[PDB]
């Protein structure tokens, strides 16, 4: 075990070389000590340290190569060295009589460049076993959090002595050791009865998730492939199904593969999985950034400056989908949806939803699906759905069975996963009626209920619904009222804040402008691409893993996403009496209007007006709603209903 000590001491020398890790350890220890000294508080920092592989390579290339080649013999010594360093500089406070027994090993985390070890579940060949690799994918299945024993403490009530027995498993420790029968020793060696001392025994949270590659880099004619990852201790519950992620960990192998006289000729392989060491939640489909995008002070200052622009609303609306010609009011409604109004959690169980749900029905090839595709590519949490390609069980909740434990469980559907997000439903008229009541309940009360298979639960899906629909006929018939032109119940239409009618009327000047714009779009050439060259995709932009006035016509899409996130987080507008007068006046005028006879205008339209005013106040970043918000909301609603302007 001399090599183990040599690796330990070289790692400690490396740690002393870069004191930033020492400062991070000190900060974590003092934060935990202060929280312990300070009440309804439960936020405790973990015993994990994130290092950069580049610094290790610069200091000792041999150690870095051993880490990236055979981590099973290099990371345990590093963990021991980190634990020794932490204890040495530990504030040595009064022991809790538990931390002495309850071990707290200091986990290791990694970031930086990985090279050929940045892989995908499809490309994870068997040659990478026992080698540390980084794999990107989507979380699809998550087993229930299940603690497991690693160390049992027992008290002998005949000698007054505490005996500990450490338990090891192939899924717990990297180095292979004899599995322990997981039996508590009830008797001492000297015939003394031992009582199992819970609380002083040590258990760790364990989880088993499934990570599969991107559907979009999945090769033609092949379905995405998946691997199993074992998150442990801190990493449990840090991810949920439907999350894009990049995990860094050891590609380990388990099982007997037959080879036990049970299967001598049978050709079954071995169990392969990943013991996750680091999780980095890349999201927003940008391939390298998280959903909660970091906001620099310069970006916040620029956002504040642009908030003083008079027509910033119009600029952002037009900057949404530049490649989509026209449809300006639709873009305004989309921008309002992406960053909507406030949700009122009233008393006595009353609940007023703040999400905006818009149904837009129109003629074929009117960019109805492309608008939803753009919203999917832009929104922080957007889930795609097809009316034909969807089942209510697969839309809300599915009663499956667990495999790690072997018993019943619920799995989230398409809208539950989109909680606090947006659901883009194409071919809305094509949805099955039996499962259409479920989405109706969703958009009605933002909650689903399950009362089957001995499971009586109520899940929350506070999503914003955008739907694209086609007329009953091949095209819309303006000679008919907008009830028979739609094959959906008017009760289903009522819960939508806005219903947008798209007509593909054949103009000449407008058609010429559309054709010119579409041709300008189609003649675009990517910067790093030549003419007559196929647009190949690799997306291996993860060169490093982890964190490693003004009047512009159109802003960049990531900047717009940052602005939307900052607005949703920061400003909580308050409705104002000046907006109240305008809202009530417009609601009264629209309600008792002759042209509004065909309209379904009811009290829900007042809720739509309030939500639109709140969203428009969010657009201005004003912490209170104002008259201009009410005027713009009334104009947009009047456009949605009548379409005159």
């Amino acid at each position: 075990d001399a090599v183990f000590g040599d690796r330990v001491r070289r790692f400690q020398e490396f740690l002393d070389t870069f004191t930033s890790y020492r400062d991070s350890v000190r900060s974590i220890q003092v934060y935990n000590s202060n929280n312990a000294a300070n009440s309804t508080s439960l936020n405790i920092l973990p015993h994990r340290i994130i290092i950069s592989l580049d610094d290790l390579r610069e200091f000792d290339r041999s150690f870095w190569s051993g880490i990236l080649v055979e981590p099973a013999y290099f990371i345990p010594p590093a963990e021991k060295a980190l634990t020794d360093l932490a204890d040495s500089m530990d504030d040595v406070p009064h022991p809790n009589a538990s931390a002495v027994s309850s071990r707290h090993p200091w986990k290791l985390s990694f970031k930086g460049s990985f090279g050929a070890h940045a892989l995908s579940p499809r490309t994870l060949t068997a040659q990478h076993l026992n080698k540390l690799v980084s794999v990107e994918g989507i979380v699809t299945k998550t087993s229930l959090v299940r603690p497991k024993l690693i160390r049992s403490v027992h008290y002998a009530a005949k000698t007054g002595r505490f005996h500990y027995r450490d338990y090891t498993d192939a899924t717990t420790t990297l180095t292979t050791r004899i599995p322990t029968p997981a039996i508590y020793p009830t008797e001492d060696t000297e015939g003394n009865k031992l009582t199992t001392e819970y609380g002083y025994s040590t258990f760790i949270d364990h989880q088993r998730i499934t990570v599969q590659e991107m559907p979009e880099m999945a090769p033609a004619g092949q379905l995405p492939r998946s691997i199993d990852v074992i998150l442990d201790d801190d990493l449990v519950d840090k991810t949920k199904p439907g999350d894009r992620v990049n995990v860094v960990g050891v590609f380990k192998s388990l099982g007997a593969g037959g080879m036990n006289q049970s299967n001598s000729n049978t050709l079954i392989g071995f169990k392969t999985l990943i013991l996750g060491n680091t999780v980095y939640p890349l999201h927003a489909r940008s391939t390298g950034v998280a959903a909660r995008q970091m906001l620099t002070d310069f970006d916040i200052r620029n956002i504040n400056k642009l908030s003083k622009k008079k027509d910033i609303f119009d600029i952002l609306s037009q900057s949404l989908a530049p490649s989509i010609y026209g449809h300006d009011h639709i873009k305004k409604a989309i921008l309002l949806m992406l960053m909507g109004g406030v949700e009122k959690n009233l008393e006595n169980g009353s609940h007023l939803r703040g999400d905006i749900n818009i149904l837009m029905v129109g003629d074929p090839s009117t960019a109805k699906s492309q608008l939803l595709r753009f919203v999917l590519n832009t929104a922080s949490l957007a889930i795609a759905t097809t009316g034909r390609g969807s089942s209510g069980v697969g839309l809300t909740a599915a009663v499956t069975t667990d495999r790690e434990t072997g018993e019943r469980r619920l799995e989230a559907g398409a809208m539950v996963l989109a909680d606090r997000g947006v659901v883009c439903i194409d071919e809305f008229d094509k949805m099955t009626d039996v499962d259409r009541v479920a989405i109706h309940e969703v958009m009605e009360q933002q909650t689903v209920t399950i009362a089957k298979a001995g499971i009586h639960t109520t899940l929350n899906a506070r999503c914003s619904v955008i739907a694209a629909a086609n007329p009953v006929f091949g095209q819309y018939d303006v000679n008919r009222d907008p009830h028979q032109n739609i094959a959906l119940p008017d009760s289903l239409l009522s819960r939508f804040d806005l219903l947008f009618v798209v007509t593909d009327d054949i103009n000449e000047i407008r058609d010429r402008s559309i054709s010119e714009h579409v041709l300008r779009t189609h003649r675009y050439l990517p910067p790093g691409y030549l003419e007559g060259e196929p647009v190949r995709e690799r997306l291996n932009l993860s060169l490093a893993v982890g964190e490693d006035t003004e009047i512009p016509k159109l802003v960049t899409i990531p900047f717009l996403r940052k602005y939307v996130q900052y607005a949703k987080e920061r400003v909580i507008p308050q409705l104002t009496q000046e907006a109240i007068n305008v809202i009530v006046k417009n609601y009264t005028d629209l309600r008792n209007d002759d042209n509004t006879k065909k309209s379904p205008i009811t009290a829900r339209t007042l809720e739509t007006l309030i939500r639109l005013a709140t969203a428009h106040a969010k657009v201005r970043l004003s912490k209170t709603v104002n008259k201009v918000d009410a005027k713009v909301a009334a104009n947009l609603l009047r456009f949605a209903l009548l379409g005159e302007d």
Partner: protein
């Protein structure tokens, strides 16, 4: 087994085999290959007495549609055949040669043959920075009187196209065209199995008897023939795969 080699009134016989190392991921389902291997035996414990499961251990593959993907989405083209392709591209009458090379047994139908050539070539896929994409496939429908070799044209297209799936109008279900949610018999878990049109990813699907589409089955292709994507939300599975067919 090859459909042309099945016995009369007999369903095709399946047979399991195993690749190894460099032979792994050499082909994809739907491809016609030839295998030289060892006819081996293993005893599965899953209903007679002293029965033994037969299989093949592979020692060679001879395909004609290249490796996984379309030659792994890159050129496996040797210099001689590439130079021959360049020489063919410089033929001024190449358009006429290709038109005459489409369904030679089918008389006339020159415009249809030229449209088939255009479809087999297809446009260039465009991916804008803003996020939405522009497809590069061509969708062609052939209406007309029966007995005009339209089915023969579809069969020839399926024969000549590197990736092609030929389907019948009546024998077609929406869950069988794009994706089927099936429960795993052993693990009791649901999973997706690619449909007919998915197997034709990057190629072409020749749907005969298009008038015999079930109205609930015909609509299921509206998204995928335009967006080139298939959205599935079933049995706790929510995915959006690509089908550029």
């Amino acid at each position: 087994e090859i459909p042309e080699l099945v016995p009369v009134g007999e369903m095709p016989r399946n047979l399991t085999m195993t690749c190894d190392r460099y032979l792994t991921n050499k082909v994809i389902p739907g491809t016609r290959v030839t295998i030289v291997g060892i006819y081996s035996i293993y005893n599965s414990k899953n209903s007679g007495v002293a029965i033994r499961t037969p299989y093949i251990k592979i020692l060679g593959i001879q395909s004609d549609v290249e490796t996984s993907s379309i030659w792994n989405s890159v050129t496996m083209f040797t210099e001689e055949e590439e130079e021959e392709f360049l020489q063919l591209s410089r033929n001024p009458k190449l358009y006429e040669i290709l038109t005459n090379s489409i369904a030679p047994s089918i008389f006339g139908n020159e415009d249809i043959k030229k449209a088939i050539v255009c479809l087999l070539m297809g446009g260039s896929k465009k991916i804008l920075p803003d996020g939405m994409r522009l497809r590069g496939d061509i969708n062609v429908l052939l209406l007309g009187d029966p007995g005009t070799a339209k089915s023969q044209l579809l069969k020839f297209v399926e024969k000549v196209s590197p990736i092609a799936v030929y389907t019948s109008g009546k024998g077609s279900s929406a869950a069988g065209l794009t994706a089927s949610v099936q429960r795993d018999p052993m693990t009791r878990e649901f999973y997706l199995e690619g449909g007919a049109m998915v197997l034709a990813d990057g190629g072409v699907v020749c749907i005969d008897e298009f008038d015999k589409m079930r109205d609930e089955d015909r609509v299921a292709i509206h998204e995928a023939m335009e967006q080139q994507t298939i959205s599935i939300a079933k049995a706790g599975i929510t995915t959006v795969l690509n089908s550029r067919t």
